[PDB]
Write a protein that binds this ligand. Structure first.
Ligand SMILES: Nc1ncnc2c1ncn2[C@@H]1O[C@H](COP(=O)(O)OP(=O)(O)OP(=O)(O)O)[C@@H](O)[C@H]1O
Ligand SMILES: Nc1ncnc2c1ncn2[C@@H]1O[C@H](COP(=O)(O)OP(=O)(O)OP(=O)(O)O)[C@@H](O)[C@H]1O
Ligand SMILES: [Mg+2]
Lengths: 578, 468, 41, 40, 128, 193, 470
C-alpha cells in the first residue's frame, strides 16, 4: 500500500510525508497501535490525517499506512440482533476482548467470521447477473435474507456453490471475469445506494397511535420530526414506533446520548417482544449506540452508517423504520469537527454546510423499486432537542424546512396525564392530500371529511378557552358548554391512548373511523336535542356517553358489532330521551 | 480540436485544487478533472496566476490524489447548446438529459454568464396579466416582463400558488384593444435542492394540466451536489432569453428556492475566505442575485417576453433576514404569505399589506382595464389598514367600547378577509374581482371614499355583497 | 411582551454579528502573520 | 379511449420509419462530411 | 390527449438518435481504417506538427512504433525525441518540457470534440 | 476650483408639500433620504427631477434596476420643462450603471456625475444632482478592499469609507464661479440600509 | 538522563526546543536554567525541526544560552494505592501535608478510557446526604451526575463541606443483603484561594472526615495546567478505588467554572481559534470526558457518583458552561439568593431543582415506601403557597379563602423548618417524619397525590423540628 512516516503531531491532526498518491477521505492507520485516521488535505508529498482517537505518546517518525479505501460498512448476514458503535464495531466482542474499558487500537470484524450459514443457491451457471439481483437466501431469525450482488458488478455466472453450511468469508459464486462474490460486500457510507426510481408516498405509515395516524399522518418513505422535552414520553413513543409499526426491520441510532439513557435503551429492548411473532424484539432491531465521551468522528458518522444499513435492507426488499435519537448532538459533533478545521462559522457557530448535510441525509428516505424489481421503503423519524425549547434554533429551522411532518411534543400535557402528550397546535402534516385517495379507496369514502369535522371541532374548542378561564364551565350557555364537553369527550376518548394496556395500545384505521363517526353522530343528535329543547346535564347522563367512553378496550375483530350497537344506541337514545 | 493535459497538481483541500504550471487557462474557464479510477468530474477556474491556478470542483473531491489525477481543458467560457426542441425535455440542472432521450442537436452555443441588457434597448412593460387571483390582479397587478417573487414560510403552500398561477395565467387581449389572440406562455421551471414530494407534486400537476409540451425542467435535487446549484438558474435564464428574443415566445420562469442558492453561495464564499456580509453571507451576494434577477423584462423591437416568479422561504419568517432583504432591493415588488391567514384556513394566504407591485401603474388604467382600478385598490388598502388597526385596538378595550364607524371598519375587514382573500382553487375574472371589491366598498359611507373620484363612485357604488 | 422579545432578538443579533466580525479579523491577521513567517521567511 | 392511443402509436411508428427512410438516402453523405471535418 | 403526441415525439426523437448513432459508428469504423490507408503517413506528420506547435518548448514526442519511421526525420530537424508506445493508437502526443503538460492529438478524440458542433450539420444534411 | 463660497439663502423647491414645508432644503444644501425597500426613495427622486426649479438635473443610476432608467427615458421627452416650457429631457443628464453591469464602475459613475454637475455650476447654472444609491458604491468599495486584502473595520467596509463620502458630499454648495457668475449644486443621496 | 539544549524562541508560556524528535507528544519535561531552578513543562507539539513546550509557571529567569530540558514521562501518570485515604495533594499528586510520600502500587494514565456502554447497569440505590431537600425531593442515586448550581456570593463551599461530612450509604434499608461496604469521598477543588483552602482543611480536620477522604487542592495562583489536570487525577483515583477494591465513592468537584476558564486560557495559549462566546469549540467533548467517568458496572459492587459545583457567571442558565453541563448531567440543584438573604441555610430552592434518576432509585426495598407521593405532594403544595404569598399583598389576608390561609402557613412552615435545617445532620426517616408533620397542617382530602393507605399510616402528627424526630 501507500506508506509514509509522521512528520508532525499536534492534537488529533497528524502530518505525514512520503505519501504521494494517497486519496482524499481515505482511512489511514497511524502509528504502531494502528489508530485509524482520515485524510483531509494533500499538498506536495504531504498528507493531512485526522486521527479518530487520542494521540498521546506518539513520536515523530512512526509509520503511517493508508488503506486505499474510504470509510465504509460491511453489508451482509448477521447485522440483525446486534449492537454497534459509531463506525460499526461490535460492542459485545469488544467487551469479551478488552473487558469493561475500551482500549485504543482494537480490531474486530463487524460481521462474525466464525458463524456458519445455510446457503441456498438461486442462480444457475452461465446466467447473466447485474447489480441488485439475488444470488441466494440465508435463514436468519425468521427472515429470508437474500444475498445481493454488489450494485456495480455486472457479469456472467461461472461457478455456483451447492447448498450447505458456509462461513461469511467463503467465496460462494465466482464470475467468468475472475471476480469472486461472497456472502458480504462493502459500501462507502457517504454514497447513496442506487435504485430504479423513487415512487411518491401514497400509502400511510401506520404508527399504531390514533392521534399520529389520523391528525398528523406520515406516509411510507416520508420524514418526521419531534422535540424531546423531558417527562413527555418521547422514549415510550419511540418504543411504540419500533414495536407496532408496519416496518419489517427497525433501525435505532444513538448519536451522542448520555451514558445512563443509553443503558436504559439497551436494557429495555431485550425484554420487549413484538406482537408479530412473540419472540424478542431485538431480532428485528439494529442498535447503534454512542456516548458523549466517545470520539467525535464516530458520532459524526453514526447517522451515515445507520442510513446506509437501512438502504441496504430496503434494497433487500423490506420496509425499514429508522430513528435518530437526537440530531442536535450529531450537529454539535459536526460543529466541533468544523471548528477543528479552522472554518469560518456561518450562524451560531454552526458550519455553513449543515443544511446541505441534513437535506442529503433526509433525502435517502423514500419508497423505491429496487434494482432487483422488488419494493422497499425507508422512513426517517429524527428527534431534535432545542436548547431551551426555542424553534428559532438553526438546526430546527433547517430540519423543519425539509421534513414533511412535525410532531410537537409537550411536557404540559404529560403533566396532565394525557398520553401521548403531542399538541394539536403547531403540529402539521403535508401528507394528508396525497393520502386522501388512498383513504377513500381503503378505509372509507368519507374519512377525510370526518377528520376535517373533528379538526374543526377541536378548533372550536380552542377558540373559546379564554372565556371558560374567565368565567368557568358551570356558568355557560348551552351551545358553548356542549361544545366544550364534546371536546373533552374527544380528548379523553379518541386522542388519548394507553401504551401499557393489552388491547388499547394498537389502533387500526377502521377503529378510529368508528370512534369519529360515533362522536359526530352524538354531536349532531345533541344539537337536534337542543333545537327541540333539552338541558345539557340531561344529555350528560345518557348511556351512549358511557358506551363511547368504553369504545376503546374492545377487540379489533369485535369492533364491528360494538360499533353497530353504539350507533343504534345513539340513534335511539336521543328520541326516547330529550 | 486538440486537448491539452495538465498533471501538475500541487495542493488539494476542500473544494479547491491548485495546478502548478497551468499558465494557459483562461479566467473562468471550464475544465474536467480525471482521477485514477477513470471517473471524470467537472470544475471551474476561479483564480489564475503565473505561479498556479485555482480550480473549484463542482462536487466532492473524494478519491482524488496528487499522483495520477489529470486535468483537461474544455472551453474558455461556460456555454450551453440551445434549440427549440428543448421544450418537453428534462435536464439534471447542469445540461444533461435525464428523461432517457438522446441529447439535443444545438442551434447555438451561448454563455450562461449572460450579458447586461442595454437600458435603451429595453421598453417599458405594458401588458396586463390576468392570473385569476383577485388579491394579485386587483391590488398587486402583475405585468409581462416584471419579476414578482413570493415570500413564504416552511409550511405555507407557495408551490401550490405558483402551480395555480402557471395554470391560470392569461393576457386578455380584448380589454387592451390589441385583439390579437396569443399562444400560452412557455414555462421554464428551475429547481434548487427540491424534495421528492415537491418534485412529484410539480410533475403530477404539470401532467394533469398538460403543460409539459411547452415546458423545460432543470431538476437539481436536494441530494445533488451543492456547487452545481449555482449554475442552474443561469442555464434556465439563458434558455429563456434565447427562446424569448430569438423565437418570439412568451416565457414564464419559475425558480423554486433561492434560499438554497444563497446557502450554497454562502458555503462557497466561506470556503473562498471572503469578507462576510451581515449573517455570514458573502459580500458580493447583491451582485450575484442581480445577475440572475435582471435578466427578465421585454426588449424594444422584439415580440418575446421574459417573466420570473422566484420563490424563497424567509428564515424564521424574518423580513429583515439578508435573503429576502437583498431580494426585495432588486425585484419590482413581492408577494408575502401570512402564517396567520393560513392558520385561519384562508387560501390563498396572501397578506395584501406587506405586498407590493412596482409596475402596476404601467398596465392598469383607461384603455387597458377598467378606469377605476387604481382608485379602488388605493381605497381598499386604506380601508383594510384602518380595519386592522381598529382590530388591534379592540383586543385591549373589548368590543362594546367601539363607535359605530369603527365597528363598520371592523366589519369591512372581516368581510374582506373572509370573501376577497379567500377564493380557493377557483378562477376569477378581473371584472368579477372588481365587482367583489365594489361590493365590499359599498359597506362604507360615501364620505369615507376620499381616494376615489366622484364619477367612479356615482357609476359603481350602491350594489350589495350578497351576489357571492 | 412582543416589544421586549423583539428588542432581545435585536440585541442578540447585534452581539453575534460583532463576535463574528471580531473572529474574522483575528483569523485574517493570523493568516497574514503566518504567511510572513512561513512563505516569506 | 384505447383506439386513439393505438392510432397515435401507429402514426408515431409511421413518422419514425419515414424519418429513418429519409435519412437512409444521405447516411453516406453525412459520413463523408464528418470524416472530412474530423480529418485535419 | 397530449400523451398521444408524447409517443410521437418520443418515437421521432429515438429514431433520430438511432440514425445519428448509425452515422457516428460508421465514421468511427471508417476512421479506424484510415491508418491502413496509404495516406496515413502523410497525415501523421501534419498531426505531429500541430501537436508540436501547440506546445512551444516541448521535450519529447510519443507515437506508435509503426509510425515512428515516418516521424523520425521530422523529429531531428525540430530537435525533439520520439517515443515508442503500445498505446496511442492512430495519434501522437506532445509532452511538455517539465513533464507535467501533455498534448494529445488523435483522430478519434477529435471526432468526439467536434461531434457537439457538427451534430446540427449532420441533422440538417439528413433532414434538409 | 471656485472663487468663493456663499451661505444658502434661497430654497430648493422640490414640489412636495411635506419636504418643502416641514423639512426644507436650500439651494446649495445636502440631503440624505434612507429607507427600506419599497419606501419610495426612487419615486421621490424622480418626482424631484420632474418638478424642481433647478436649471439642470443630473441623475446617477448607481447600481439599481435598468427598468427605472428605461421608464425615465421613455416618459421624459413627452413631459414639459417647468421653466423654459420645452421637452423635459432637454435639461437632464443620465448616468446609468445597473446592477448587472460591472461592479467597479459604480465608483466611477458617481465621480463622473458630480464632475459634470460641477462643470454646469461653473457655467453659471443652478444644478441638482440625484444619486440613486450610495450603498452600492459602498459595496463596490468593500469588494475592492477585499481584493486588496485590506483589514475590515465595520461590516467589512474599508476604514476610509467616511472620507470618500465626505469628499463626495463636499463638492456641493453655492459658490461664486471663477468667471464671476453665480451657481450652486444640490446633492440628494439615497441610502439602502 | 536524555536532556536537550538549544532553545531558540521564548515568548510568554511557550518555548521552542530543536533536535527533539525523541520527545513524545503530550510528554512532561523539566526546564532548568543556569541557577539550578527547575520548572515543569508539557510538550504540546512535536515536529522534526523543533518541539514546542508550554511552561507550567512564569519564565522570569530563562534564557537561550544556559537552559536545559530533560524528559520525565512519556504520558502523565499517577501512582495509586489503597492508602491514599487521609492525604492531601497540590493537584499533580505532590503531597502537601508534610507526610512522607506514598508507595505506588501501580501507575495509571490520568486520561481515562471510556466505559463500554454494554457493561453499564441501571442505577438502583440512593445516597443519604443528610439534607432534607436533597434526600427527600431530589434524591441522589448511586451512579448519577447531579450538579449544584450556585450564585456568586452564595455559600456553596459550606454545602460541599457539609455533604462531604454527612454523606453515607444506607445498606439497612435494602432489607436483603444487610451488609455494609466501604465508603470513600474524593474531593477536588480548582482555583480556590487561601481562605477557602484553610476553611476546607479545618472542616475536614475538626470532625475527622479525613479518615475517609482524599483531597486534591489547587490554588488560584497555581499554574493553570495543574488546574486542568486536577479533575482527571481525582477521577482516576476514584475509578481505581471503586472498580478495584469494591468501594462506593462520591466525587465532589468544585468550581467547574474555573476549569472552563482555565480551558479557555489554554486554548488561547495554543493559538487555537476561539469558538462561540470565546470558549473552545471542543468544550463539550472536554466536559463529557470528565462527567461521563461515573456510573455502575455489571459484576462489580463499587460505584462512582459525581456532584459538580459551578456558579453561573451572570446568573444566566444560557451561558455556555451551565448549558453544556445541563446537556451532559441528569439534573441540578438550585440555590436561591432570596433564601440566603432571609437567613435560611442551606438555601436550596425546591421549585427549580430536578433529579432525573429520582424515580428509579426510591420506593419499595430501597427507601421508605411513601417517598415519591410525599415528594410530589410537597412540591405541589409549596408551589401553590408561593403564589398566594404574593397575592396576599394586593388582595389582603382577610379576603383569602380558608384554605389559602392554611397554604400560607404551610409555605412559611416549610421555609422555616424543612429547608432551614442548619448544620444538623438528618436521617431519611427523620426527614420524612418532618415532611408528614408539615403536611398534617393541611386539611385531609387536599392531598391528591398521596394514596389513602399511606395517609392512614402516617397522618396526624405535630411539628417534629422542635422534637428532633426521636
Ligand atoms: N402513551 C403512554 N401511555 C401511558 N403512559 C405513558 C405514555 N407515555 C408515557 N407514559 C408514562 O411516562 C413514562 C415515561 O415517559 P415520561 O413522560 O416519563 O418521559 P420520557 O419518555 O422519559 O422522556 P424523555 O425521553 O424526553 O426524557 C412511562 O413509564 C409512563 O409512566
Ligand atoms: N410619493 C409616492 N406616491 C405614490 N406612490 C408612491 C410614492 N412613493 C412610493 N410609492 C410607491 O412605492 C413603489 C415604488 O417605490 P420605490 O421604487 O421608489 O422605492 P425605493 O425606496 O426607491 O426602493 P428600492 O431601494 O428597493 O429601489 C410603488 O408601488 C409606488 O406606487
Ligand atoms: Mg428604486
Amino acid at each position: 500500500m501507500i506508506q509514509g512516516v509522521i512528520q508532525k503531531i499536534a492534537g488529533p491532526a497528524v502530518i505525514a510525508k512520503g505519501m504521494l498518491g494517497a486519496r482524499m477521505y481515505d482511512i489511514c492507520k497511524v502509528g504502531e497501535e494502528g489508530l485509524v485516521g482520515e485524510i483531509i488535505r494533500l499538498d506536495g508529498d504531504t498528507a493531512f490525517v485526522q486521527v479518530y482517537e487520542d494521540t498521546s505518546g506518539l513520536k515523530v517518525g512512526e509509520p503511517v499506512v493508508s488503506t486505499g479505501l474510504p470509510l465504509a460498512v460491511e453489508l451482509g448476514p448477521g447485522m440483525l440482533n446486534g449492537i454497534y458503535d459509531g463506525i460499526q464495531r461490535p460492542l459485545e466482542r469488544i467487551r469479551e476482548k478488552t473487558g469493561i474499558y475500551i482500549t485504543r487500537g482494537v480490531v474486530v470484524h463487524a460481521l462474525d467470521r466464525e458463524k456458519k450459514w445455510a446457503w441456498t443457491p438461486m442462480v444457475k451457471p452461465g446466467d447473466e447477473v447485474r447489480g441488485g439481483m439475488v444470488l441466494g437466501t440465508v435463514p436468519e431469525f425468521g427472515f429470508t435474507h437474500k444475498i445481493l450482488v454488489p450494485p456495480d458488478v455486472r457479469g456472467r455466472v461461472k461457478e455456483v456453490k451447492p447448498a450447505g453450511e458456509y462461513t461469511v468469508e467463503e467465496p460462494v459464486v465466482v464470475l467468468e471475469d475472475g471476480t469472486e462474490l461472497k456472502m458480504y460486500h462493502t459500501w462507502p457510507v457517504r454514497r447513496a445506494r442506487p435504485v430504479q426510481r423513487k415512487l411518491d408516498p401514497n400509502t400511510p405509515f401506520l404508527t399504531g397511535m390514533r392521534i399520529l395516524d389520523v391528525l398528523f399522518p406520515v406516509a411510507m418513505g416520508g420524514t418526521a420530526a419531534i422535540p424531546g422535552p423531558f417527562g413527555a414520553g418521547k422514549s415510550v413513543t419511540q418504543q411504540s414506533l419500533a414495536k407496532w409499526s408496519n416496518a419489517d426491520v427497525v433501525v435505532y441510532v444513538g448519536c451522542g446520548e448520555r451514558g445512563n439513557e443509553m443503558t436504559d435503551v439497551l436494557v429495555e429492548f431485550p425484554e420487549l417482544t413484538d406482537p408479530k411473532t412473540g419472540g424478542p424484539l431485538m431480532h428485528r432491531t439494529v442498535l447503534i449506540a454512542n456516548t458523549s465521551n466517545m470520539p467525535v468522528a464516530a458520532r459524526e458518522a453514526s447517522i451515515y452508517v445507520g442510513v446506509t444499513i437501512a438502504e441496504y435492507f430496503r434494497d433487500q426488499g423490506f420496509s425499514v423504520a429508522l430513528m435518530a435519537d437526537s440530531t442536535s448532538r450529531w450537529a454539535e459533533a459536526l460543529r466541533e469537527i468544523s471548528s477543528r478545521l479552522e472554518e469560518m462559522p456561518a450562524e451560531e457557530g454552526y458550519p455553513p454546510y449543515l443544511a446541505a448535510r441534513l437535506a442529503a441525509f433526509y433525502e435517502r428516505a423514500g419508497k423505491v423499486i429496487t434494482l432487483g424489481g422488488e419494493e422497499g421503503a425507508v422512513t426517517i423519524v429524527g428527534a431534535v432537542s432545542p436548547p431551551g425549547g426555542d424553534m428559532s434554533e438553526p438546526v430546527t429551522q433547517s430540519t423543519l424546512r425539509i421534513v414533511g411532518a412535525f410532531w410537537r411534543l409537550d411536557a404540559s400535557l404529560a403533566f396532565r396525564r394525557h398520553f401521548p402528550a403531542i399538541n394539536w397546535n403547531g403540529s402539521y402534516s403535508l401528507f394528508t392530500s396525497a393520502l386522501d385517495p388512498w383513504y377513500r379507496e381503503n378505509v372509507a369514502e368519507d374519512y377525510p371529511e370526518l377528520r376535517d369535522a373533528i379538526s374543526e371541532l377541536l378548533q372550536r374548542e380552542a377558540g373559546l378557552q379564554e372565556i371558560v378561564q374567565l368565567v368557568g364551565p358551570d356558568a355557560l350557555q348551552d351551545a358553548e358548554r356542549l361544545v366544550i364537553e364534546v371536546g373533552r369527550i374527544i380528548r379523553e376518548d379518541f386522542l388519548q391512548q394507553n401504551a401499557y394496556h393489552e388491547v388499547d395500545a394498537y389502533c387500526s384505521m377502521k377503529k378510529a373511523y368508528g370512534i369519529m363517526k360515533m362522536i359526530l353522530a352524538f354531536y349532531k343528535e345533541a344539537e337536534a336535542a337542543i333545537k327541540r329543547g333539552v338541558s345539557i346535564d340531561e344529555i350528560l347522563q345518557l348511556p351512549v356517553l358511557e358506551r363511547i367512553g368504553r369504545a376503546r378496550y374492545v377487540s379489533e375483530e369485535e369492533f364491528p358489532a360494538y360499533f353497530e350497537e353504539a350507533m343504534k344506541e345513539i340513534q335511539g337514545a336521543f328520541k326516547a330521551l330529550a | 480540436l486538440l486537448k491539452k493535459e495538465y498533471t501538475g497538481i500541487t495542493y488539494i483541500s476542500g473544494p479547491l485544487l491548485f495546478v502548478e504550471n497551468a499558465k494557459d487557462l483562461a479566467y473562468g474557464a471550464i475544465v474536467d478533472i480525471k482521477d485514477g479510477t477513470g471517473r471524470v468530474r467537472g470544475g471551474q477556474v476561479i483564480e489564475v496566476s503565473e505561479e498556479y491556478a485555482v480550480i473549484q470542483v463542482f462536487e466532492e473531491t473524494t478519491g482524488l490524489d496528487l499522483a495520477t489525477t489529470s486535468v483537461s481543458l474544455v472551453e474558455d467560457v461556460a456555454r450551453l447548446g440551445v434549440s427549440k426542441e428543448m421544450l418537453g425535455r428534462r435536464f439534471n440542472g447542469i445540461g444533461k438529459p435525464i428523461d432517457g432521450l438522446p441529447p439535443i442537436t444545438p442551434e447555438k452555443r451561448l454563455p450562461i454568464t449572460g450579458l447586461p441588457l442595454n437600458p435603451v434597448a429595453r421598453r417599458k412593460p405594458e401588458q396586463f396579466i390576468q392570473t385569476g387571483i383577485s388579491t394579485i390582479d386587483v391590488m398587486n397587478t402583475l405585468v409581462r416582463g416584471q419579476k414578482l417573487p413570493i415570500f413564504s414560510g416552511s409550511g405555507l403552500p407557495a408551490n401550490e400558488i405558483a402551480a395555480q398561477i402557471a395554470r391560470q395565467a392569461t393576457v386578455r387581449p380584448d380589454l387592451s384593444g390589441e385583439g390579437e389572440k396569443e399562444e400560452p406562455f412557455a414555462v421554464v421551471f428551475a429547481a434548487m435542492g427540491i424534495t421528492q414530494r415537491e418534485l412529484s407534486y410539480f410533475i403530477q400537476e404539470f401532467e394533469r394540466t398538460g403543460a409539459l409540451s411547452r415546458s423545460v425542467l432543470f431538476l437539481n435535487k436536494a441530494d445533488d451536489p451543492t456547487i452545481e446549484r449555482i449554475l442552474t438558474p443561469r442555464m434556465a435564464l439563458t434558455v429563456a432569453e434565447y427562446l424569448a428574443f430569438e423565437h418570439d415566445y412568451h416565457v414564464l420562469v419559475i425558480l423554486t428556492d433561492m434560499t438554497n442558492y444563497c446557502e450554497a453561495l454562502r458555503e462557497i464564499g466561506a470556503a473562498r475566505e471572503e469578507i462576510p456580509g451581515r449573517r455570514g453571507y458573502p459580500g458580493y451576494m447583491y451582485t450575484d442575485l442581480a445577475t440572475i434577477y435582471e435578466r427578465a423584462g421585454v426588449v424594444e423591437g422584439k415580440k418575446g417576453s421574459v417573466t420570473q416568479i422566484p420563490i424563497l422561504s424567509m428564515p424564521d419568517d424574518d423580513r429583515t433576514h439578508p435573503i429576502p432583504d437583498l431580494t426585495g432591493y432588486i425585484t419590482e415588488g413581492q408577494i408575502q404569505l401570512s402564517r396567520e391567514l393560513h392558520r385561519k384556513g384562508i387560501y390563498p394566504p396572501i397578506d395584501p399589506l406587506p405586498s407590493l407591485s412596482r409596475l402596476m401603474n404601467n398596465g392598469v388604467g383607461k384603455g387597458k382595464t377598467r378606469e377605476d382600478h387604481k382608485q379602488v385598490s388605493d381605497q381598499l388598502y386604506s380601508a383594510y389598514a384602518n380595519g386592522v388597526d381598529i382590530r388591534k385596538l379592540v383586543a385591549i378595550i373589548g368590543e362594546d367600547a367601539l363607535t359605530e364607524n369603527d365597528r363598520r371598519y371592523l366589519q369591512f375587514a372581516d368581510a374582506f378577509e373572509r370573501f376577497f382573500i379567500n377564493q380557493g382553487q377557483q378562477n376569477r375574472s378581473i371584472e368579477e374581482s372588481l365587482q367583489i371589491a365594489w361590493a365590499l366598498l359599498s359597506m362604507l359611507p360615501q364620505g369615507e371614499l376620499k381616494r376615489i373620484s366622484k364619477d367612479h363612485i356615482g357609476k359603481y357604488y350602491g350594489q350589495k355583497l350578497e351576489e357571492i | 411582551i412582543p416589544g421586549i422579545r423583539a428588542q432581545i432578538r435585536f440585541i442578540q443579533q447585534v452581539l453575534e454579528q460583532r463576535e463574528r466580525e471580531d473572529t474574522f479579523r483575528l483569523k485574517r491577521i493570523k493568516g497574514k502573520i503566518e504567511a510572513r513567517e512561513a512563505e516569506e521567511e | 379511449t384505447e383506439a386513439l392511443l393505438a392510432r397515435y402509436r401507429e402514426r408515431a411508428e409511421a413518422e419514425a420509419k419515414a424519418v429513418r427512410e429519409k435519412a437512409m438516402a444521405r447516411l453516406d453523405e453525412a459520413v463523408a462530411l464528418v470524416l472530412k471535418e474530423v480529418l485535419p | 390527449e397530449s400523451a398521444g403526441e408524447l409517443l410521437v415525439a418520443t418515437a421521432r426523437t429515438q429514431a433520430r438518435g438511432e440514425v445519428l448513432e448509425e452515422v457516428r459508428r460508421r465514421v468511427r469504423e471508417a476512421l479506424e481504417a484510415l491508418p491502413q490507408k496509404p495516406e496515413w503517413p502523410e497525415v501523421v506528420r501534419k498531426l505531429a506538427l500541430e501537436a508540436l506547435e501547440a506546445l512551444p518548448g516541448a521535450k519529447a514526442l510519443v507515437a506508435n512504433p509503426e509510425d515512428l519511421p515516418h516521424l523520425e526525420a521530422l523529429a531531428r530537424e525540430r530537435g525533439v525525441e520520439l517515443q515508442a508506445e503500445p498505446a496511442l493508437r492512430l495519434g501522437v502526443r506532445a509532452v511538455g518540457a517539465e513533464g507535467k503538460t501533455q498534448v494529445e492529438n488523435s483522430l478519434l478524440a477529435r471526432l468526439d470534440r467536434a461531434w457537439d458542433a457538427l451534430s446540427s450539420k449532420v441533422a440538417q444534411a439528413l433532414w434538409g
